[PDB]
Q: What sequence folds into this?
C-alpha cells in the first residue's frame, strides 16, 4: 500500500499550501543568498554541536482530507451529554451569525495584539463594548479587556489587593464555597509568595486574623445565593478589599457587586455564547473601583484622539508602579482573550439587556419549577435562595444510583458530598429536559403532578433585597443591532477597519504570524470538541484523551522532553508554570533557599515578572558587545549566587535572533552550580527538526502553540503555552484532574482544550518532513529579507557566515540621526503601503525586528522590502533637504481617505504620493481608519509596546 | 401538550422572527404612524382585496428556535447514510478545498448578492466568472464559453436548441448516443417534444447518416466509461451539415484530446468534479463552450472585458432560450479549484484517478472478471451474480452502478485511496486474501487510453492559474475580489421583483453537513431516508402555502419553473386530445422569460393590454380569450401584478380563461406579498412556480438560478416530472430527480423557524416597508400604480422620467450615483422604462430604509441643481458617478464640485465608506431587467 501509493501521481500536499515560497521561488532566494541548496544554508546557519542528527519520530504526513477524517474518528469517541454539572461552566447557545462571522472568520482570528492601533479600531471597539458590558453588569466603574479564566482572574484580584493594603496582614480569605478549581488556582499562586490562604465559611469568619482581601462566590458553587453586605462591611472595617466572583448572567437579576459595596468583581463570560470547549478558551472579566484603576492588571481599551482631533481607541497598559509591595503584587499578563471577549460582547449586543434578562429569567423559572417538582417527589433542597443551581439531598444510598440513571439519559449531574447532588440549569434547557430530570429522580415516567400545574407555585427564589433594580446595557450599541442583518453589517464594518492575515503579511518579530489553515481550524467548532464540559466523566471524553496522549507524545518528540503538560493557557502561564516546577524541585530536595533566577538583560519583560511571581529574586546577566550572552558575567553571578541558584531563563535562539553555539556550555555551567535551565519557546520556529531544547541542556521549556504551531493569534490572545520537562521534573506538573504537584496553573485541567486540535492537525498534516522544512524555509525567508535590505538598513546580530536565524533586526537609528525620523514614523508610513509594522523597538530600542515566517510568498516578501526601500528614500529626501523635515509623508502617516479628500491640502507632497506610494496599492488599497493616535521607551513588562 | 402550555408561561426565548424582520415592534409602530394607520392589521386589511384574502391561519408546524430547528433537522439528516458511491453517471465525489469551503461557500460576502446588474460594484465575482470561462475555454479547446448553465442535461438541451437554430440542415431529427447519461437523454426528450424535434437514440458506431440530422450529442467518456475516437463520426456529421456536441468530463480533458481538437462544434458538461459537493443532485455549474461562428445564438450570460470612464479595464456581464442567470456561486467555486490546483494539480488529480482505475482493472482481471471497455478514464464496465456483488459492496458502505444483468459499473474519483481499492478487490474476490499483492500490479500499469486521444496541448497557462497556490495567497486573492463587491453584508439591495431578504446563518448551515452535501443523487433509497422526509415535509408545507394539491421540487431555476408549469399545461391538453390548444395569453408588462418559456413549450404568444391605470385590461383579455377560444392553452399571470398591484379582478380573470378552456399559470415573482395573506390556488390558478431563492431565503448566490418548484391542482398532477430514473409525466425538467436538492434545506429551515405566524408577519412587514418608502419618496418621485386605498403591495415604482425632462438625467445616472452613497441600485427600467422598482423586503431595518430614502432625496436635490442652472449639466456628480478613490486623489481636479461632495454626500459615508472599484463602464427582450 505505502509503496504502492508512493508510485501514484502526487496528491495535494499540505506542506505546499502552508509554505509561501514554492520550489522555484526558493531557488531564486537561495541564488540571491549564494547557496546551491537550502540544505547548504541550513548547515551554515545551525551550529553542528546542536544540530539534531536524525528525522523526528512522528507519524507520516496526511492530506487535509485524510487528517480531518482521522480526527473525525477520534472526535466520534467523545460523547456530548446534557451536562448540568455547573462549577463555572454552563452550556450556552452561540448565535449562528456570531459563530459563522466571527469564530469561523479569519478576518477576526488572524491578527495579533493591537500594537498598531490605527489599523485595529474594529476589534478595539468590540473590546470597548466588552468593558462597557462588564461595567454595567458588575456595577463597578473600571473593567479591563479580559483575563485568562475565572481562577486566574481571582488570583489577579488577590495580587491587586495585597498591593493596596498598608497593614501587617498576609492572609487572603477564600470562601470554602468558591468553585474548587478557583481555590486551587489561588493556592498555587499564593504558595511561592508566602501568602496565607484561609479557606473558610463567610457566615462565621471572625476576622480575628488580619486579611488584606477576601474572595466570595456569587452565587456560591453549590448554587446558594447569599447577601454579602454585612461581610463586606466587616471586611472594610478591617481594611480588606472584597472580591466577588460573580456569574455575569446572574447579574441581570441579582444586585451586583458594585451595589453590594464590593471592591473588585471577577468571573467568566463563557455563558455569553462561548462554547464549553472542554475548558476553554473563554474570556474572564475583571472590574474594580476608579480608585484602583492604575493598579488594574492586563490590558484595557481607552478612548483617545487622532491627529485630526477625531475619537480613536488604543489598548492601554498597566502603569509601572514603584513600591515596597511589588514583590507580591506583580502581574505577567500582557494579553487579553480578545477573540472570546469579542464574542461575549457581541452576545450582549445581539441580545440587548432585555434579551439577556429573559435568558436568565427563563433559566431561573425552569430551576424553580425543577425544585418544586423535586420536593413533590420528596427530595430535600438545601439552598434557601438560588439562581440556576440546586443542592439536592437524596439519601447516601441513592446518590450514585441517581447519577447513574441520569447518565442513562445522557445527562450529567454534579456529585456533591454523599447523599447530595447538584444541578445547574442553563440556556439550552427546555421543558422536555425538565421532564427528563423529574423522571430520573422519580424513578418512573409517570409523575404525581402535571408540569403545568406547578406553575402557580413559581415565584422569584432569591430575596427582595438582592433583586436588582438598576439598569444595564442602555448604550445605543446594545440596542440597535438585534436583527441578523444589522449585526452582520456591524460585524463586517468593524472587521473591515482591521488589518489581518487575509490582507497582508504581518511580519512581527518573536510572534510567528504564520498560516492558520482552514483544515486546522475546522474541528474547533465540532460539538464533539466544542460542547464538552471540562468536568464531564472520563467515560465520555475518550476522544480528548486520545488527542492529549498524541499531542503530548508529538510535542515531547519535537522538544526532546520526557513529559508534557497541556494545561498552561498562555505563553506567560507557560513561563510561570515552568518556574513553579523548578521551584518545587528544589523544595523536594529540602533547598528552600534556591531562589535566584539568572535572566539575560535582553529578555522579554514577562520573564522577570514570572520569576517574581514565583518568589524568585532576579539577577540580570549581561549581553556581549557582539550582542551575545556574556559567559563571564554569567559565571561571576553563577558563583556569587552559586548556592542560592534556582534557575536560568534563556531563549533559544536568543532574543537577538542568534543561534548562539555556546548554548550547551551555558547550560553545563548552570547545572554545575545547582540551578535548572528553563527555555522560553518564543523562537521555537527556528528550531523544529533542527534542534531540541532537552538535547542542549534545558530542563524545562514552554511552547507557544499560537506561534510555532498555528493556533491563531486571535486579535491578541494568550493562545496556549504547554510545558515540556525532563523526567526529574515530571512529578511536579500541574494536576490533570480535580502528590508533589504544584497544583493548578489554569482553571481547567487541560486549559483551553478545544483549540489544541489545531496544533494536532498541523502536526498530522505536516509530518516529520513537513515540520522540518517549514523551519528551514522560515530561516531562508528571514535571510532573504536581510540580504535585500542590508545596503539600506544595517542588519544587527549576524552569524556564522553572517546569517540570521528566523528573524532579522533592522537598525533604524541612522534615520533618526540623519533625518530625525523615529521608528514610529516608519511604522505608520508602512500602513500607507498596506502593511502592519514588524515588532518595534524590542529587543533593541529604535530598531525593527522582522519575522516573515515560512508561510509568506516571495512576492509578499519583495513588496515589504520594496516598501522599506521606498521609506529609506523618503528619509533621504528629508536628510538632503529636498522636503520639509516636519511636514512630509513619514511624519503625517497614516493618511486616511478623508484627510486626502476633504478640506484644504497644505502639504509639500501630493495626495497621490501619500496614498499610493507603491504600484500594488493601485490594485488593492487598505484604508487606515484613523489618523495617527496620540502617544518611545518600552514598557518594562510588555516589552514590545510603549511605556504607559 | 402539557409541556406546550407550561412552556408558554416562561420568559420569552430568542425568536427567529425577530432576527429575520428588520423593523422591530417599535420601528413598525413608527412606520405605521407615518402611513396613517394605528395597527399593521388595519393596513393589511386595506392593502389586500377582501375577496382573495386567505381567511385562516396557515396549517404549518409551530415555529421553532434556531437551536431547536437545527437539532430537528440534524435528527432527520442522521437518517441519511454517507456511502462511498462509485456510481458515476455524471456525479463524482470530490474534495472541496477547506479554504474555498470556508471563505466562499460559507461566506455571506460571496453568496448574498444577486446578478451583476450594476457591474461597477460586482467586479469581484465578474473576475471569478471570467476565470471560469477561461478555464472552460482552455479545457474544451473551444473559443467561446459562457458564465455557466444549470446542469449537464439542460446544457445539452441548450446545445440541441443552438444546433437547431444554426444548422443549415433541413432535417428535423437530433441524434443522441445511447451511451449518454440516462438523465441527459430524458432532459433532451422533454425539451424536444414541444418543439416537434425527432430525437433518435442510437449507437454512434453503426449510425448510418442516411437518416438526416441537424445535430448529434455524444458522451466523452461514455456513460459506461468507454473512451471512443469520435473524429470520423464528427466528419460525417459535418458532411450532412449537422453540428456535434460532446458532453465531456472536464477533469478527463486534462488527459484526453478535447472536443475543440476533435472537430466538435459545442462542448457541455458539469463542473461538479471541480470541488463542488455532490449535493444529492446540486447545485453545480454546467459549462457550455462553442465557436465564434456560432456565438450569436449561444444561451445564458458571458463576462466580457470592457473599459471604464478612465480608460481602465473593467468587466461586465454581456430555438429561443429562457435562461437569464448563471450558476454564479458554483462557477466561482469551480474556477477557484482551478486557480488553487493549477494545470499540474488538476492533471495529477486526473492521473491518480486513472492509475487507480487501471490498477483496479488489473486486479479484477486476476480475479477472472471480464472488462468490457477497450479504453477508459475513471470508469469500468465489469461483467460477472451482480445483485450479490452490489449487496456485498453495500456491506462495506459502497455503492456500485447496476448496469444490465451480469454487469456492474465502477467510477473512481478524487477521494479514492489504495485502501478503497483494496476494499473493491476484496468485494469482488469474496475474501480478504488476494492472489496478488497491490504493489506487484504496478508493473502492468499503463495509460489505458490511446495515443490518438492522448492530449498534448496545454491549459490554464495564464498567470491567475499559477500564482495563488499557497493557502495564504488564495485567501488574500479571495478577500480582494470579495472586497470589490457590494453584497447584503454591506447594505440593502432593494431590487424590485428579486426579494433580497435575509439568508440566515441557521438556514445556510445544514447545506454543508455531509449528510446532505455528500450524497450521490442516484444512491439507493435505503440510504436517503432523511432526504425523503425533507422532501415530504417541504412538499406538504409549500402545498399549504400555495393551496395546491401537489408539488414538484425538481425544477432548478425560476425559469425552469415557468417552463415546467407550461409543459404540464401542454400535457394536460394533449391528454384531452386537444393539441390545437397552444395559444398563451401574456400581459404586455410580463418579464421576458415568460414568453420565452411559452415559446420553448411550442406555444404561440398573444399579448394582453394593460389598462389606462396599469391593470390587466379585462375587456381586452375577454376579447382575446373569446377570439382564440378554440385554441386557448393558457394565461400567464404574476400576482400581485408586475406593476406591484393587488388587482381585485384576479379571480374574474381566471374565470374568463377557464370559461374558454385555458389553464392559468401564475409566475411566483411576487409571492413575498402573498404568503399567509392569499393563495394562488384559491383565486383560480391551476399551477404556479415559487422562487425559493426569493421568497424562501435561498441565497441569490451572486446571480444564481436558485430553485423553482411548481405547485399544481389535482387534475395536473399526473403530468409532473419524474422523481426517479407508461405514465403521463412530461419527463425530466432537471438532470437530477430533485434538482439542486442540498439547498432545499434552506427553505425547510426558514419555514420551521418562522411557523405560520412568522411567515405571515414577514409578508405583512414587507408590505409595510414598501408602503413606508413610497410615502417617504412620493413628494420627490411620483409613485406609479397604487392599488385600492392608494396602497402599494411589497414594492413601489418610482418615476424617474421627470428628471430626464427637467435635468436630462437618466435612470442610469441615478443608479451609479447611489454607489457613491454606498447603495446598490433597485431594479432599473423594468417593468416601466425610465423608472426604478424598489423592494425593501421585511428584513431591512427602519434605519436602513431611511438612509436609502435620504439618498434618493439627496439625489433629487442634485438633479434640481442641474435643472436650476446651479451646476454644469454635463459635469456633475450624477453624470460622473461612480467616483473611485483614485479619481478623487490622482491627477488634476477640474470638476465644478468638490471631491468631498463626490465621495461623502451623506453623513453615514463618513462613518463607513464603500469604494466603487471602477468608474462608469462604457432593454433586453428576454432578460428584461437589463
Ligand atoms: Cl512526512
Ligand atoms: Cl408559529
A:
Amino acid at each position: 500500500l505505502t509503496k504502492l501509493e508512493e508510485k501514484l501521481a502526487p496528491a495535494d500536499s499540505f506542506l505546499d499550501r502552508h509554505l509561501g515560497p514554492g520550489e522555484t521561488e526558493q531557488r531564486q532566494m537561495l541564488q540571491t543568498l549564494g547557496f546551491d541548496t537550502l540544505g547548504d544554508l541550513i548547515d551554515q546557519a545551525v551550529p553542528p554541536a546542536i544540530r539534531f542528527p536524525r528525522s523526528l519520530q512522528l507519524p507520516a504526513s496526511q492530506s487535509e482530507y485524510g487528517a480531518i477524517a482521522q480526527l473525525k474518528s477520534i472526535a466520534s469517541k467523545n460523547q456530548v451529554f446534557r451536562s448540568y454539572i455547573g462549577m463555572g461552566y454552563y452550556d450556552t447557545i452561540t448565535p449562528p451569525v456570531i459563530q459563522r462571522n466571527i469564530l469561523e472568520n479569519p478576518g477576526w482570528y488572524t491578527a495579533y495584539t493591537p500594537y498598531q492601533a490605527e489599523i485595529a479600531q474594529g476589534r478595539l471597539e468590540a473590546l470597548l463594548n466588552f468593558q462597557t458590558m462588564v461595567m454595567d453588569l458588575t456595577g463597578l466603574e473600571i473593567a479591563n479587556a479580559s483575563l485568562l479564566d475565572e481562577g486566574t482572574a481571582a488570583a489577579e484580584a488577590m495580587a491587586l489587593s495585597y498591593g493596596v493594603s498598608k497593614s501587617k496582614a498576609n492572609a487572603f480569605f477564600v470562601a470554602q464555597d468558591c468553585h474548587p478549581q478557583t481555590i486551587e488556582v489561588i493556592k498555587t499562586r499564593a504558595n511561592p509568595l508566602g501568602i496565607e490562604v484561609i479557606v473558610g465559611d463567610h457566615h462565621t469568619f471572625s476576622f480575628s486574623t488580619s486579611i488584606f482581601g477576601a474572595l466570595l462566590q456569587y452565587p456560591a458553587t453549590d448554587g446558594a445565593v447569599y447577601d454579602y453586605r454585612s461581610f463586606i462591611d466587616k471586611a472594610h472595617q478591617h481594611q480588606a478589599l472584597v472580591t466577588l466572583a460573580a456569574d455575569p448572567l446572574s447579574l441581570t437579576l441579582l444586585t451586583p457587586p458594585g451595589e453590594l459595596g464590593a471592591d473588585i468583581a471577577v468571573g467568566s463570560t463563557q455563558r455569553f455564547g462561548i462554547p464549553l470547549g472542554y475548558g476553554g478558551p473563554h474570556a474572564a472579566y475583571f472590574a474594580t473601583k476608579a480608585e484602583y484603576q492604575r493598579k488594574m492588571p492586563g490590558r484595557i481599551v481607552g478612548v483617545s484622539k487622532d491627529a485630526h482631533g477625531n475619537p480613536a481607541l488604543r489598548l492601554a497598559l498597566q502603569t509601572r508602579e514603584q513600591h515596597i509591595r511589588r514583590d507580591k503584587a506583580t502581574s505577567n499578563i500582557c494579553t487579553a482573550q480578545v477573540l472570546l471577549a469579542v464574542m461575549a460582547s457581541m452576545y450582549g449586543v445581539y441580545h440587548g439587556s432585555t434579551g439577556l434578562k429573559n435568558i436568565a429569567l427563563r433559566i431561573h423559572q425552569l430551576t424553580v419549577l425543577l425544585a418544586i417538582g423535586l420536593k413533590r417527589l420528596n427530595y430535600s433542597l438545601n439552598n434557601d435562595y438560588f439562581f440556576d443551581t440546586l443542592r439536592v439531598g437524596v439519601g447516601e444510598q441513592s446518590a450514585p444510583a441517581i447519577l447513574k440513571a441520569a447518565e442513562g439519559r445522557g445527562i450529567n449531574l454534579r456529585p456533591l458530598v454523599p447523599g447530595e447532588v447538584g444541578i445547574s440549569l442553563d440556556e439550552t434547557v427546555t421543558v422536555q429536559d425538565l421532564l427528563d430530570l423529574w423522571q430520573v429522580f422519580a424513578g418512573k415516567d409517570n409523575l404525581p403532578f402535571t408540569p403545568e400545574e406547578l406553575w402557580s407555585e413559581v415565584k422569584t427564589s432569591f430575596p427582595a433585597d438582592l433583586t436588582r433594580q438598576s439598569l444595564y446595557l442602555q448604550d445605543a450599541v446594545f440596542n440597535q443591532y438585534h436583527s441578523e442583518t444589522e449585526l452582520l453589517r456591524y460585524l463586517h464594518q468593524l472587521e473591515s477597519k482591521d488589518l489581518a492575515l487575509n490582507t497582508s503579511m504581518i511580519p512581527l518579530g518573536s510572534c510567528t504570524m504564520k498560516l492558520n489553515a482552514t483544515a486546522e481550524m475546522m474541528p474547533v467548532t465540532w460539538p464533539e470538541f466544542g460542547k464538552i464540559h471540562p468536568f464531564a466523566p472520563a467515560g465520555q471524553t475518550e476522544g480528548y484523551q486520545i488527542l492529549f496522549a498524541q499531542l503530548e507524545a508529538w510535542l515531547g518528540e519535537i522538544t526532546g522532553f520526557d513529559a508534557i503538560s497541556l494545561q498552561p493557557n498562555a505563553g506567560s502561564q507557560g513561563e510561570y508554570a515552568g518556574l513553579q516546577v523548578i521551584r518545587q524541585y528544589h523544595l523536594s530536595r529540602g533547598e528552600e533557599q534556591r531562589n535566584i533566577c539568572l535572566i539575560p538583560e535582553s529578555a522579554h519583560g514577562t520573564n522577570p515578572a514570572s520569576a517574581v511571581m514565583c518568589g524568585m529574586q532576579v539577577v540580570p546577566v549581561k549581553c556581549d558587545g557582539e550582542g551575545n550572552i556574556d559567559v563571564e558575567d554569567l559565571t561571576s553571578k553563577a558563583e556569587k549566587y552559586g548556592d542560592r541558584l534556582a534557575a536560568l531563563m534563556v531563549t533559544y535562539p536568543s532574543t537577538h535572533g542568534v543561534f548562539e553555539a555556546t548554548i550547551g556550555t551555558i547550560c553545563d555551567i548552570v547545572h554545575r552550580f545547582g540551578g535548572e535551565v528553563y527555555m522560553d519557546g518564543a523562537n521555537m520556529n527556528a528550531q523544529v527538526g533542527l534542534c531540541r531544547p532537552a538535547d542542549f541542556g534545558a530542563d524545562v521549556c514552554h511552547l507557544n502553540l499560537h506561534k510555532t504551531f498555528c493556533i491563531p493569534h486571535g486579535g491578541g490572545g494568550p493562545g496556549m503555552g504547554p510545558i515540556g520537562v525532563k523526567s526529574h521534573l515530571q512529578a511536579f506538573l500541574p494536576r490533570t484532574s480535580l502528590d508533589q504537584s504544584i497544583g493548578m496553573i489554569s482553571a481547567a485541567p487541560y486549559g483551553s482544550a478545544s483549540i489544541l486540535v489545531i496544533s494536532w492537525m498541523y502536526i498530522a498534516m505536516m509530518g516529520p518532513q513537513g515540520l522540518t522544512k517549514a523551519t528551514e524555509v522560515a530561516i531562508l525567508s528571514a535571510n532573504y529579507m536581510a540580504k535585500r535590505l542590508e545596503n539600506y538598513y544595517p542588519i544587527l546580530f549576524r552569524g556564522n557566515n553572517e546569517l540570521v536565524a528566523h528573524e532579522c533586526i533592522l537598525d533604524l537609528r541612522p534615520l533618526k540621526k540623519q533625518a530625525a525620523i523615529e521608528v514610529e514614523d516608519v511604522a505608520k508610513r508602512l500602513m500607507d503601503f498596506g502593511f502592519h509594522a514588524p515588532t518595534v523597538s524590542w529587543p533593541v530600542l529604535g530598531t525593527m525586528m522582522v519575522e516573515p515566517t515560512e508561510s509568506e510568498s516571495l512576492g509578499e516578501l519583495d513588496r515589504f522590502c520594496d516598501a522599506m526601500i521606498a521609506i529609506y528614500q523618503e528619509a533621504q529626501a528629508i536628510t538632503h533637504g529636498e522636503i520639509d523635515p516636519a511636514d512630509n509623508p513619514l511624519k503625517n502617516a497614516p493618511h486616511t481617505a478623508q484627510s486626502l479628500i476633504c478640506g484644504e491640502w497644505n502639504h509639500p507632497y501630493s495626495q497621490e504620493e501619500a496614498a499610493y506610494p507603491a504600484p500594488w496599492t493601485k490594485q488593492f488599497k487598505f484604508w487606515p481608519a484613523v489618523g495617527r493616535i496620540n502617544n518611545g521607551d518600552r514598557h518594562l513588562v510588555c516589552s514590545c509596546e510603549g511605556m504607559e
In short: DSSP finds 31 helices and 26 strands in chain B. Residues 1-930 of chain B form one domain. Chain B touches chain A through 90 residues (CB under 8 Å).
